[PDB]
Design an enzyme around this catalytic site. Structure first.
Site, PDB file in Angstrom:
ATOM      1  N   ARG A  61       0.824  -1.205   0.000  1.00  0.00           N
ATOM      2  CA  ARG A  61       0.000   0.000   0.000  1.00  0.00           C
ATOM      3  C   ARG A  61       0.859   1.257   0.000  1.00  0.00           C
ATOM      4  O   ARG A  61       0.547   2.233  -0.693  1.00  0.00           O
ATOM      5  CB  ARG A  61      -0.934   0.000   1.209  1.00  0.00           C
ATOM      6  CG  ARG A  61      -1.939   1.142   1.202  1.00  0.00           C
ATOM      7  CD  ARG A  61      -2.237   1.648   2.605  1.00  0.00           C
ATOM      8  NE  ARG A  61      -1.074   2.283   3.217  1.00  0.00           N
ATOM      9  CZ  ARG A  61      -1.118   3.010   4.328  1.00  0.00           C
ATOM     10  NH1 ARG A  61      -2.271   3.202   4.953  1.00  0.00           N
ATOM     11  NH2 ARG A  61      -0.008   3.552   4.814  1.00  0.00           N
ATOM     12  N   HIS A  80       2.507   6.178  -2.108  1.00  0.00           N
ATOM     13  CA  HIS A  80       3.576   7.148  -1.920  1.00  0.00           C
ATOM     14  C   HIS A  80       4.561   7.181  -3.077  1.00  0.00           C
ATOM     15  O   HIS A  80       5.334   8.141  -3.181  1.00  0.00           O
ATOM     16  CB  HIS A  80       4.318   6.873  -0.608  1.00  0.00           C
ATOM     17  CG  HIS A  80       3.556   7.300   0.607  1.00  0.00           C
ATOM     18  ND1 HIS A  80       2.817   6.422   1.371  1.00  0.00           N
ATOM     19  CD2 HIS A  80       3.405   8.517   1.182  1.00  0.00           C
ATOM     20  CE1 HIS A  80       2.250   7.078   2.369  1.00  0.00           C
ATOM     21  NE2 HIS A  80       2.592   8.351   2.276  1.00  0.00           N
TER      22      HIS A  80
END
Lengths: 132, 117, 132, 132
Positions: free
Chosen positions: D96, D101
Site C-alpha cells: 500500500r 507514496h
C-alpha cells in the site's frame, strides 16, 4: 514532539510489565526469573524518566544537568514538579545501579518495596509531563 | 570531528554493498543512519555497528533507513547531517519520509490523543 | 529539478488518464470500475502535488509541515502559490481522503464536478512550480 | 463495536469488487482501468485493516504505532494475531505504501500474486477480529 510521547509510552509499557510479571507477589520472592524481569523493567522506567527530564531541561532551557539526579533538581527548581516527587525519582535513580549486580539478599526486599510503593511516582511523572 | 566522519564513511562504504546514503544524527552513542539498495541483515547490521563502535571508541547505533520506522526516518530527515550520498537520493528519501510521516500522523492521531489525555 | 520533473510527468499522465477514462461521463455514475480508476488517478495527482510541496518546503527551509494541507498552507504563506489555489488543492486532498478512507458517504457528483472543473488546479500548480 | 463492523463490511465489499473486476486475470496486464480498480480496492482493504488495528490498539492501550506496519506488530506481540498473519498484513501495508507514496515502480506481478494468494489474509483478519 515524538520523543516525549514515545518515552511516556515506554514508561507505561514497563509499568504494565512490572504489574503483570509481579502479579500478587506470592511467587515473586520465590522465582528469580520474575525478579529479573521486574528489575529490568524498573531500570527501564527509571532510565526513561531520566531521559524525559533531560529532554525537558534542554528544551525549555532550564539549565545544564550536572548529573542524572540534578536533571530532576532542574525540574523541581522551576516548580515543574514538587520536591517530594523529585526526591522519589532520585530514589529511583539509585535503584537502577543497585539492581544491576547480583546481590540478591539485599535488593530483593528493596525491589519489593519499590514495586509496592514507587510505581505511583512514575505514573505521577507521566501525568505531570502529559500536561505540556 | 571531521576526521571521525571520514572513518565512519569509509567503514560503512567498505562493508555495505550498493550503499546510497550516510546520515549522522543525534559522549554516549554515535547516531548513524544508512540507506542502501537492500535492507541490511539485522545481525549483520548490529555486527557492523559494533565494528564502528570499536573503531571509534564510542557506542554506535546503525539505523537501516529501509526497515526503520517512519518516526525514526522523520527524525533523521529533520536533524540528520548527510555524510555521504548524492543530493538527489537525499531529496527523494526526505520527501518520501515526510509524506509517509504526514499520512501516519493522520493515521495514529486518535491513539496519541487518547494516551496524552 | 529532476524530482519535480518526474512528479510533474506523473501528474500529467494521471490527468490524461482521468480525462480518457471519464470520457463524456455517460457511464460514470453506472460503472464502478471507471469510478475507481478516476479516484485512484486523482489520489495520484494529489499525492504528487503533496510531494512537490514537501520538497519545496524543505528546500527553501520554510519548515517541515505536520499535515499534507500544511504544506500548501506554507507555500501560500510564503507567497509561492495563491490562497485560492491552496484551498482548492487542500479540498482535493479532502476529497481523496473521503474517497479512500470512507469517513463519509462518497458523493459521485463531487467527483464529476472535480473532473469537470478542478483538474485545472493541478495544471495551474504545475505551471506555477515550473516557473520557479 | 460499530466501527469494526463498518470496516469489516468495507473489507468484504472491496474483496468482492477485486474478485469481480479481476475475473480470470487474462485482461489484467492489458486493461489499465482494471488494474486501477484492483489497486484502489487493495489499498482500501489495507486502510480498513489498519483502521481496525489502530482502533483496537487505542481501546486496549497497546502502545502507539511507529509506522503503518507497526499497527499490526503491536497486535502480534500481544498474542491477538499470529505472527504469519501479522507478517502478511505488514507485506500488504508495504504494498500500500508503494502504491500511494510512489517511492518505487509499482510491480504488477506482485499485485497479481497478492490478488491470487493474499486476500485470504484479509478474510483471516476478519475472522480473528470478529471474535473480539
Amino acid at each position: 514532539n515524538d520523543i516525549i510521547i514515545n518515552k511516556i509510552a515506554t514508561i507505561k509499557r514497563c509499568i504494565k510489565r512490572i504489574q503483570q510479571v509481579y502479579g500478587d507477589g506470592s511467587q515473586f520472592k520465590q522465582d528469580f526469573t520474575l525478579q529479573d524481569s521486574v528489575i529490568l523493567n524498573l531500570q527501564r522506567c527509571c532510565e526513561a524518566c531520566i531521559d524525559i527530564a533531560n529532554h525537558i531541561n534542554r528544551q525549555q532551557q532550564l539549565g545544564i544537568p550536572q548529573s542524572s539526579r540534578d536533571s530532576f533538581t532542574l525540574l523541581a527548581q522551576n516548580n515543574l514538579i514538587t520536591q517530594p516527587l523529585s526526591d522519589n525519582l532520585k530514589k529511583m535513580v539509585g535503584l537502577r545501579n543497585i539492581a544491576v549486580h547480583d546481590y540478591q539478599e539485599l535488593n530483593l526486599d528493596i525491589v519489593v518495596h519499590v514495586v509496592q510503593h514507587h510505581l505511583e511516582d512514575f505514573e505521577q511523572f507521566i501525568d505531570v509531563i502529559k500536561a505540556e | 570531528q571531521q576526521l571521525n566522519e571520514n572513518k565512519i564513511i569509509k567503514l560503512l562504504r567498505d562493508n555495505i554493498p550498493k550503499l546510497q546514503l550516510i546520515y549522522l544524527f543525534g559522549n554516549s552513542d554515535i547516531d548513524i543512519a544508512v540507506l542502501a539498495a537492500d535492507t541490511l541483515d539485522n545481525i549483520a547490521r548490529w555486527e557492523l555497528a559494533q565494528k564502528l563502535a570499536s573503531a571509534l571508541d564510542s557506542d554506535v547505533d546503525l539505523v537501516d533507513l529501509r526497515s526503520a520506522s517512519t518516526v525514526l526516518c522523520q527524525q533523521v530527515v529533520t536533524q540528520g547531517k548527510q555524510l555521504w550520498g548524492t543530493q538527489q537520493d537525499d531529496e527523494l528519501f526526505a520527501v518520501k519520509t515526510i509524506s509517509m510521516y504526514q499520512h501516519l500522523q493522520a493515521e495514529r492521531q486518535a491513539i496519541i490523543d487518547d494516551v496524552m489525555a
